[PDB]
């Protein structure tokens, strides 16, 4: 057994997802707007040869807001909608086809040196049956790297591996707002339309890995 060092490039690409559920009734009320895990598949090219990779994006530490426009059978409420802000995290899994990810079993140390990215939000229409429709638009946040975590599950003499990246968050210049309401000009990124009609987001950087490998 012997210790080695692996210094490679990395590009990670990801998305968001959501779920929107109404309540039963006359059609004026809404119960949930929340995040949901999403996954993506791509190929990119290092110095020598192309590599195919996978990601899975998730979230934690979620702030949840609400709106209550009275109590009648014909009024606009939102029971819960979620938003990501300073007290929250973004989790991204990553596993690759390359020769370097075969030696990520017995890891001594691991560091990563990525750069930041900004995610901004789009717009969403609340389609009431009768009347003008309120909209929810705006919001922005930026992502900064905060550590790497490896985990294993033990199931019948076979290990099941994962590699997760952490990202802390900081609010940015556009505020979000909900038209035809009193709710006024907050910061953070809601889950109405996170992707803003993009195919993916992108972060590039490098990492350094030290691990025990079996010596020939």
């Amino acid at each position, epitope marked *: 057994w012997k210790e080695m*060092q692996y*210094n490679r*490039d990395i590009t990670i690409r990801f998305k968001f997802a959501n779920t929107i559920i109404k309540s039963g009734g006359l059609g004026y009320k809404w119960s949930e707007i929340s995040f949901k895990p999403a996954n993506y598949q791509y190929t990119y090219t290092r*110095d020598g040869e192309e590599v195919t990779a996978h990601t899975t994006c998730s979230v934690n530490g979620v702030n949840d807001f609400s709106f209550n426009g009275g109590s009648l059978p014909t009024d606009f409420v939102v029971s819960k909608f979620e938003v990501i802000k300073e007290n929250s995290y973004v989790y991204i899994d990553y596993w690759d086809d390359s020769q370097a990810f075969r030696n990520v079993v017995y890891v001594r*140390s691991l*560091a990563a*040196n*990525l*750069n*930041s990215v*900004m995610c901004t939000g789009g717009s969403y229409n609340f389609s009431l049956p009768v009347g003008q429709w309120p909209v929810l638009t705006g919001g922005a946040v930026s992502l900064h790297s905060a550590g790497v975590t490896l985990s294993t599950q033990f199931t019948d003499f076979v290990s099941l591996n994962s590699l997760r990246f952490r990202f802390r968050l900081a609010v940015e210049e556009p505020h979000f707002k909900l038209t035809r309401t009193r709710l006024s000009r907050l910061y953070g990124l809601p889950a109405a339309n996170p992707n803003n009609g993009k195919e993916y987001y*992108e972060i*590039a*950087g*490098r990492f*350094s890995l030290i691990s025990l490998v079996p010596s020939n």
Partner: antibody
Amino acid sequence: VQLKESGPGLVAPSQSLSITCTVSGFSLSRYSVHWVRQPPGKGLEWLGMIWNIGSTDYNSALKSRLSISKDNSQSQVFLKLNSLQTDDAAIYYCARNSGFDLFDFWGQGTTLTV
Amino acid sequence: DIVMTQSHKFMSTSVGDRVSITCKASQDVTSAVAWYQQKPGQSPKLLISSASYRYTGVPDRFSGSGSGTDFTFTISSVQAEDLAVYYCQQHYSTPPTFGAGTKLELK
């Protein structure tokens, strides 16, 4: 944060070089440091990088000459470069990494005559 | 080895007007270009980190834009202190590469 270079200033051909960059205001176990240079009448060129733990990247053309080490306790990082030619006359800088390759804070710089 | 090429080496401008400085890339660098400034007898200073994102202690008259391979750096109104040299860096791949350098001459 402050960075400060200190070098010989005059060296003969086919000799060595040693520059010491003493840092202040931050820790070397949290951040990572670069080295660059600028020849007269030419643009800037990248030389190397030392990581948080002991780990180095180098330039491909000058890989077989130079080496970078550091000391965490007495907060100072030093460079070496051997068997140098008359092309190597430049002003050497030590700078701090912030993001991926962004050079956040720069030093004063020492000049080399050969 | 992505090559960053600035087309000009000198710019002439007056005391209040617009200045624009450009540089191209050899490959596709997806919005990962920084900008620097070096006043006479100093060290360089970071101004724009990404292709548009300004830094904290930078005046409001500096800005930047661009995507793909073409990139710009603008000043809305000049002053007498803006006489320096400017650089465009790429921070997308493993060796970071600088541009040539464009001196600004105030007329």
